[PDB]
Design a protein around this ligand. Sequence first.
Ligand SMILES: CP(=O)(O)Oc1ccc([N+](=O)[O-])cc1
Ligand SMILES: [Zn+2]
Lengths: 220, 214
Amino acid sequence: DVKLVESGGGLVQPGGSRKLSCAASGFTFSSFGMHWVRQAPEKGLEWVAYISSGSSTIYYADTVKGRFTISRDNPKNTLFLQMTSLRSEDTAMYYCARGDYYGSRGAYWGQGTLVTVSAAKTTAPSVYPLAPVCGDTTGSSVTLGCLVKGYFPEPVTLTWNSGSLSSGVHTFPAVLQSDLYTLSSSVTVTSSTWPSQSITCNVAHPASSTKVDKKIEPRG
Amino acid sequence: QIQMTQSPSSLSASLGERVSLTCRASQEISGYLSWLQQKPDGTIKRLIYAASTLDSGVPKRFSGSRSGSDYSLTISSLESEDFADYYCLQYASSPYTFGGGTKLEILRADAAPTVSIFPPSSEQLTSGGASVVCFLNNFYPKDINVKWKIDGSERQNGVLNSWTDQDSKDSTYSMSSTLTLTKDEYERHNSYTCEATHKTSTSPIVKSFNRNEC
Ligand SMILES: CP(=O)(O)Oc1ccc([N+](=O)[O-])cc1
Ligand SMILES: [Zn+2]
């Protein structure tokens, strides 16, 4: 079955440039015109470029005219978007989508890749175990939490017991304060479970090669 | 640009209830309207195209229609899978414009939060900082007020809130209040209250620890 796979996201300093790839499979690439659609952190979808099957009709969003270059290598089933003069606004999730709705029948979007254009820098996070000591929640229930603060950029992977514990957990979305992110995840287990068992926060900030684990031990 | 004014911008409805999102295009598109559906996991899937042709797979309870320059998607009898974000797409003229969005949330029956206050971790303290995280779980509606109170006083400078999306199973929201302070100031006060006000009850669901010996 059809499947597009974007890939070229990263942290890019303003003014810099990045070149994304969108691999396609399950369809005669060479017959359809592709598109690139972006979506800003918490906003809508926004069309960006469109290249006809032959690469002989290209269109561009007013917002990207001139800075971006769209292209494809038909024999390698890959679409591309070369970016230039990456502003802050350029920050978003870059999905690739097959087009030519005119007759085509099927319609297929990608997963999206993320490109964050900041001046910031990378910054590994600190993981603080949130041992109850007052995590009330009912008494018959004992909630624990985990604090991941001071990282950049997104995303990070938090998990309760290397995956194992995956029920009763509420991971809250990240928030940018100053020029850093903070995220936390709560998780609930029955009184008995903790501390008879060991629940652990495993955080991994990909973009900075950071992987950590926190034994949520009682005390404070 | 051909503006696609989409509405409403969000709406809650109970299951089985019908809904009609609408897109008004500012120019003739001759029905080159399409309706996309973005699921919370990010995933995008087309539902209707050619302004009324359902895609292969899309349940026959979805139906596009057009009258004038007003295009409408009607979901009759809303089931769970329908909880998502919809976008209208007009592919008639070059600068391709999308509608604004509709965030369709599930109308659940009321549910008060489950506040649980957590004092600073000993590892953070030695870092110099001190954060008093305070989770408020499984409530509904989303509307929830949280006041932080270091000792007698209510404080603001330092709060870092972050709500969750409507949960997949219980359809309830969840929050995270995080007051940060320098170890210094934290250890120069004694009580800390995370008091939340929610439509479920009338009396502030208070949760407060306090430092001192142990
Ligand atoms: C006639 P054509 O398929 O190119 O119209 C489309 C253009 C853009 C698009 N998009 O998702 O960005 C989808 C369809
Ligand atoms: Zn269904």
